Write an enzyme that holds these catalytic residues in place. Structure first.
Site, short mmCIF file in Angstrom:
data_model
loop_
_atom_site.label_atom_id
_atom_site.label_comp_id
_atom_site.label_asym_id
_atom_site.label_seq_id
_atom_site.Cartn_x
_atom_site.Cartn_y
_atom_site.Cartn_z
N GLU A 46 34.25 31.65 43.78
CA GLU A 46 35.40 32.52 43.52
C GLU A 46 36.42 31.87 42.60
OE1 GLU A 46 37.08 33.94 47.16
OE2 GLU A 46 35.48 35.42 47.45
N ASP B 268 42.31 39.64 38.26
CA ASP B 268 40.87 39.61 38.53
C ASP B 268 40.19 40.79 37.86
OD1 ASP B 268 41.77 41.67 40.20
OD2 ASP B 268 40.35 41.18 41.79
#
Ligand SMILES: CCCCCCCCCCCCOC[C@H]1O[C@H](O[C@H]2O[C@H](CO)[C@@H](O)[C@H](O)[C@H]2O)[C@H](O)[C@@H](O)[C@@H]1O
Ligand SMILES: CCCCCCCCCCCCOC[C@H]1O[C@H](O[C@H]2O[C@H](CO)[C@@H](O)[C@H](O)[C@H]2O)[C@H](O)[C@@H](O)[C@@H]1O
Ligand SMILES: CCCCCCCCCCCCOC[C@H]1O[C@H](O[C@H]2O[C@H](CO)[C@@H](O)[C@H](O)[C@H]2O)[C@H](O)[C@@H](O)[C@@H]1O
Ligand SMILES: CCCCCCCCCCCCOC[C@H]1O[C@H](O[C@H]2O[C@H](CO)[C@@H](O)[C@H](O)[C@H]2O)[C@H](O)[C@@H](O)[C@@H]1O
Ligand SMILES: CCCCCCCCCCCCOC[C@H]1O[C@H](O[C@H]2O[C@H](CO)[C@@H](O)[C@H](O)[C@H]2O)[C@H](O)[C@@H](O)[C@@H]1O
Ligand SMILES: O=C(Nc1ccc(F)c(F)c1F)N[C@H]1[C@H]2C[C@@H]3C[C@H](C2)C[C@H]1C3
Ligand SMILES: NC(=O)CN(CC(=O)O)CC(=O)O
Ligand SMILES: NC(=O)CN(CC(=O)O)CC(=O)O
Ligand SMILES: NC(=O)CN(CC(=O)O)CC(=O)O
EC number: 3.2.1.17
Length: 900
Positions: A731, A740
């Protein structure tokens, strides 16, 4: 201090370029193999003396001025057929013509032939002695062309086939060269005896260690490439230094066995890795990082045990030392290059072809747990008995007795000495050189003679002391420089030599003349003096550097001091049985060898080899028991865990080595038998008595004192890979606010700050969460803080879900992290959809679970992360993350973004 980053790098690199690697190295090994078959033509028989000694100096001066002695090159006993006397003029003419033919057909090799047969009408007493009194035998001397031992032996081996047919074949050849040809020829028979007997036996022991053809064949192929490449290396070495004849079988005796043992131990580990669930790439890397380092360190140990032999001046020991190093280094390199690349290509295919295609340790260690002294005390005794035949041993040079008692050349020599006594002499020489350069006068010669007559023990055949110490004979190959004179006389006892040489040297030279004491006894005694001189230093270097390497391997002071005692006892015990066998003579009858003193340089070789073997087998066994201590496992079955893990490998490895060594014990060269038996004994001792009993016993009693780490001597334990570093890969880790893949403001490790479009709303949240004004920026420590909270939030959510709690409790800490990873990515509701896969994990059916999980849409949409997580489930280790395909490009915030 250590570097496995190196091995982790190579373990990865070798898989990547497995085709280039397997192509290049095989090309060199076969290339060197083709280059290295000519090695037999470029080896020397010289190197048994100290070429810096006074006796060698005496020899070089003597041969320069007077010419080298060629009278002992070829001695040939001729015997008339049909009980005829040697006076038979018809037989004389026939043989004389036969001999004259051989000489004129080979004038480049033969100087000529000399004997009574050439001038039968003579009154020269010595020439008249070249015939027996019963007139049934007569011998001739056949001097050969050549300016060194090797060139002369080559000249003999050229003329021998025809020289042998003289007198209808009934001619018995003896002397230096017929014996040298026979001694050096033993190498050849030993090489082929290994090809015929050892190879098939090894193939069998290999197919019994692995139940598979491909798996069994690979260590054998490695052994072949090792020899080929090593012979090429040695042939290359022969271009610079002289390489002794005896270096060739060493490449086979030692090199082949270790290469196969290396291959066996590495292929064995690769299968272990595949079985535990790792794919080919990871399997290869893990094999190199572990067993590969064991092999390399083993190579280091052997080299460290062999280098001290370079302290000795004998070229015999030097070339042998070079041979051992070349063999072991190449074997270690090949085992982690060619072999690793092969497995990387083959993969699980190594078990494809079965046996048909061609067509308990821990209980016993426990028995020795219970009563140390029951076994140990009664073994320390059995071994020190063996050290007392060691106590008495003699030393000597090469003689015809080095060949078996039934060898035709040896007997021809021994018949010559019986029929013609007094011709074979070993005189000590007094070599005189005048420094200023002018001729030596007869007064100084007579002066030295008088001083020579001071010392007792020198032969006086016709009872006249002023005809003793006659001048050495001169021939056409000598410069006849008047400033050099040589006188000589034999000893009446050869055992007096060492004393008499020291006496001859204790003498004071005529003013202005340098005196060197030479002769074959002097050459031998000076060589022996050199070895005993530098033996203490070698033993110290040997013991220290191995003990130092054991400091590094064990992480203890007690164990290396303990192990060195074990080595010194296996060494002393083995050399004792050796002395008992070859000096005291036990076993000589069955084995067809003559009891006699040992070759002196063989003692340094046998110390280094036995010590290295003992040390290598110890380091492997003990360092696995160290692992138990590292793991927190107690001593008592730390000792058992290591013994059992290695148990079947060590026997298989030792058996393979025993088979190779066992083929050389049948050699006709006696010093080869000594060496080969020294291996077998030390090997069987180290693989049974030492390993199975003495070591477990002694280690228990100093029960937890075995390991001891003053200060920083011991290594600190590495950072253990954790769930933080895991999801940092999957991640990412960002210290500044970013968007993101959904355009949401995220920070740290996939930590959602807010779905709001306002960056300052995001900065508000981050300031809230961290506890300070962050300006959208946090430290690494603060990111781990946010992440831990998120992990806690997810675990709480997992323990709250009825479909996830059972499997979560079932799992180990590592596999728990694998589940939390899935929860982070797709949420609890998503993970709970893997009902059967979760059941399989709960039942610890790792393989079935891993296979089932890869058949998900989760795997297809995100293969790289899924494969990592699934791998983690399969093996229960962090392996898929500690080394990986770097670079996540797509960042997405995880579920359970925890807010305070
Ligand atoms: C492993 C160890 C192997 C065993 C070693 C065996 C050693 C055998 C030694 C054989 C030596 C034979 O002896 C050689 C004898 O003859 C030589 O040639 C000469 O013969 C007559 C002279 O007397 C004349 O015709 C000529 O001057 C000349 O040709 C020397 O000149 C003589 O000084 C010597 O007496
Ligand atoms: C692979 C298995 C190995 C088998 C071992 C075979 C050993 C057979 C023995 C052959 C020895 C020949 O000995 C004969 C010679 O002995 C010495 O010279 C030798 O020693 C000197 C100092 O080193 C060198 O300078 C000389 O070159 C060198 O000929 C004498 O000075 C020579 O006058 C004499 O002719
Ligand atoms: C041309 C320039 C190049 C010249 C430099 C070439 C020289 C090569 C030097 C490299 C030496 C590396 O060998 C030492 C490494 O392995 C040993 O441990 C091995 O022995 C036991 C297994 O039996 C366990 O301790 C381990 O599992 C096992 O790795 C050492 O104890 C470690 O400290 C170190 O990691
Ligand atoms: C790869 C392995 C190949 C073969 C391995 C053989 C290793 C040899 C180990 C030691 C040999 C003893 O065992 C076999 C030997 O027994 C006897 O010895 C007799 O004389 C010896 C000295 O006096 C003493 O042993 C006894 O007094 C008496 O039994 C025979 O007379 C020998 O002919 C035979 O050799
Ligand atoms: C755990 C231990 C594992 C052991 C592995 C075994 C290694 C495999 C090698 C087996 C082959 C046995 O070969 C025995 C060799 O000797 C024979 O007779 C000789 O015997 C004495 C010298 O040896 C002297 O009497 C004479 O030279 C002569 O009569 C033949 O000369 C050779 O043709 C034969 O090859
Ligand atoms: O064969 C040896 N050593 C060795 C052999 C012959 C010698 F002449 C010598 F000097 C030696 F040191 N070691 C084996 C190898 C290395 C390591 C694991 C496996 C495979 C068991 C054991 C220990
Ligand atoms: N006579 C024998 O038994 C031979 N012996 C020699 C000896 O007794 O010293 C040992 C052997 O060769 O095996
Ligand atoms: N990974 C899974 O559990 C997939 N499962 C889904 C499920 O158990 O409902 C289907 C299957 O086992 O074939
Ligand atoms: N590696 C990436 O860039 C995106 N990843 C998704 C992720 O890391 O969560 C896709 C994949 O693992 O195949």
């Amino acid at each position: 201090f250590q570097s496995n980053a190196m091995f982790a790098w190579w373990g990865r690199t070798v898989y990547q370029f497995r085709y280039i690697v397997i192509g290049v190295m095989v090309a060199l090994c076969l290339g060197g193999g083709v280059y290295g078959i000519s090695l037999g033509n470029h080896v020397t028989q010289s190197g048994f003396y100290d070429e810096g000694s006074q006796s060698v100096a005496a020899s070089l001066i003597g041969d320069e001025v007077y010419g080298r002695d060629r009278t002992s090159h070829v001695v040939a006993i001729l015997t008339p057929p049909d009980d005829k006397k040697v006076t038979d003029k018809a037989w004389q003419k026939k043989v004389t013509e036969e001999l004259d033919q051989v000489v004129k057909d080979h004038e480049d090799q033969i100087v000529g032939w000399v004997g009574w047969l050439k001038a039968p009408d003579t009154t020269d007493p010595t020439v008249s002695a070249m015939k027996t009194q019963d007139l049934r035998h007569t011998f001739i001397s056949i001097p050969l062309q050549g300016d060194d031992d090797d060139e002369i032996l080559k000249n003999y081996q050229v003329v021998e086939p025809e020289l042998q047919q003289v007198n209808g074949g009934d001619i018995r050849l003896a002397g230096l060269n017929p014996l040298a040809s026979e001694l050096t020829g033993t190498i050849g028979e030993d090489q082929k005896r290994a090809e015929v007997a050892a190879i098939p036996l090894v193939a069998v022991v290999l197919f019994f260690v692995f139940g598979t053809v491909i798996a069994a064949a690979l260590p054998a192929i490695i052994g072949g490439l090792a020899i080929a490449g090593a012979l090429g290396i040695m042939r290359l070495v022969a271009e610079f230094t002289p390489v002794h004849f005896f270096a060739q079988p060493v490449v086979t005796l030692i090199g082949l066995g270790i290469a196969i043992d290396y291959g066996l131990f590495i292929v064995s580990r690769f299968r272990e890795e595949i079985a535990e669930g790792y794919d080919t790439e990871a399997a290869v890397r893990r094999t190199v990082m572990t067993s590969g380092r064991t092999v390399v360190f083993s190579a280091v140990i052997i080299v460290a045990s062999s280098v001290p032999l370079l302290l000795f001046p004998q070229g015999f020991l030097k070339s042998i030392t070079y041979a051992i190093i070349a063999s072991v280094m190449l074997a270690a390199i090949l085992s982690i290059t060619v072999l690793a690349a092969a497995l990387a290509i083959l993969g699980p295919r190594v078990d494809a072809l079965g046996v048909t295609t061609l067509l308990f340790w821990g209980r016993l260690v426990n028995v020795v747990m219970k009563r140390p002294i029951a076994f140990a005390a009664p073994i320390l005794v059995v071994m020190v008995l063996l050290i007392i035949p060691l106590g008495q041993l003699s030393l000597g040079g090469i003689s015809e007795k080095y060949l078996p008692p039934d060898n035709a050349v040896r007997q021809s020599q021994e018949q010559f000495d019986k029929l013609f006594p007094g011709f074979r002499t070993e005189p000590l020489t007094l070599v005189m050189k005048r420094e200023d350069g002018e001729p030596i006068t007869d007064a100084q010669i007579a002066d030295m003679r008088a001083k020579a007559l001071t010392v007792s023990g020198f032969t006086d055949p016709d009872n006249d002391p002023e005809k003793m110490w006659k001048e050495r004979p001169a021939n056409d190959s000598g410069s006849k420089d008047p400033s050099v004179r040589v006188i000589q006389n034999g000893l009446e006892n050869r055992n007096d030599a060492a004393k008499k040489i020291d006496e001859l040297r204790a003498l004071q030279p005529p003013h202005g003349i340098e005196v060197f004491v030479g002769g074959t006894p002097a050459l031998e005694q000076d060589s022996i003096h050199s070895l005993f001189d530098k033996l203490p230093l070698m033993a110290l270097i040997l013991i220290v550097t191995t003990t130092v390497l054991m400091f590094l391997a064990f992480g203890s002071v007690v164990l290396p001091i303990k192990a060195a005692l074990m080595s010194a006892l296996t060494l002393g015990s083995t050399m004792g049985i050796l002395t008992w066998m070859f000096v005291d003579g036990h076993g000589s009858g069955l084995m067809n060898y003559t009891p006699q003193p040992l070759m002196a340089p063989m003692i340094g070789l046998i110390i280094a080899v036995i010590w290295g073997l003992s040390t290598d087998y110890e380091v492997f066994l003990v360092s696995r028991m160290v692992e138990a201590r590292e793991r927190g496992m107690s001593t008592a079955e730390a000792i058992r865990i290591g013994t059992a893990t290695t148990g079947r490998l060590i026997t298989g490895a030792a058996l393979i080595l025993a088979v190779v060594a066992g083929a050389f014990v049948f050699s006709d060269l006696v010093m080869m038998k000594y060496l080969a038996f020294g291996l077998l004994i030390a090997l069987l001792l180290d693989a049974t008595i030492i390993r199975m009993f003495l070591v477990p016993a002694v280690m228990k009693l100093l029960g937890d004192d075995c390991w001891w780490a003053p200060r920083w001597m011991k290594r600190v334990q590495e950072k253990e890979f954790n769930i933080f570093e895991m999801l940092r890969i999957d991640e990412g880790l960002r210290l500044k606010i970013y968007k993101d893949t959904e355009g949401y403001y995220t920070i740290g490790i996939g930590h959602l700050l807010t779905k709001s479009p306002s960056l300052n709303a995001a900065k508000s949240e981050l300031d809230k969460a961290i506890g300070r004004n962050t300006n959208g920026v946090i430290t690494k420590d603060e990111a781990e803080k946010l992440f831990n909270q998120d992990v806690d939030a997810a675990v709480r959510g997992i323990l709250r879900n009825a479909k996830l709690k059972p499997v979560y409790d079932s799992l180990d800490a590592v596999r728990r992290a694998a589940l939390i990873n899935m929860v982070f990515q797709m949420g609890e509701t998503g993970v709970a959809g893997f009902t059967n896969s979760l059941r399989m994990l709960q039942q610890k059916r790792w393989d079935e679970a891993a296979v089932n999980l890869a058949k998900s849409r989760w795997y297809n949409q995100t293969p790289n992360r899924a494969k990592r997580v699934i791998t983690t489930f399969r093996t229960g280790t962090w392996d898929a993350y500690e080394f990986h395909l770097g670079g996540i490009k797509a960042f997405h915030h995880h579920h359970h973004h925890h807010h305070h």
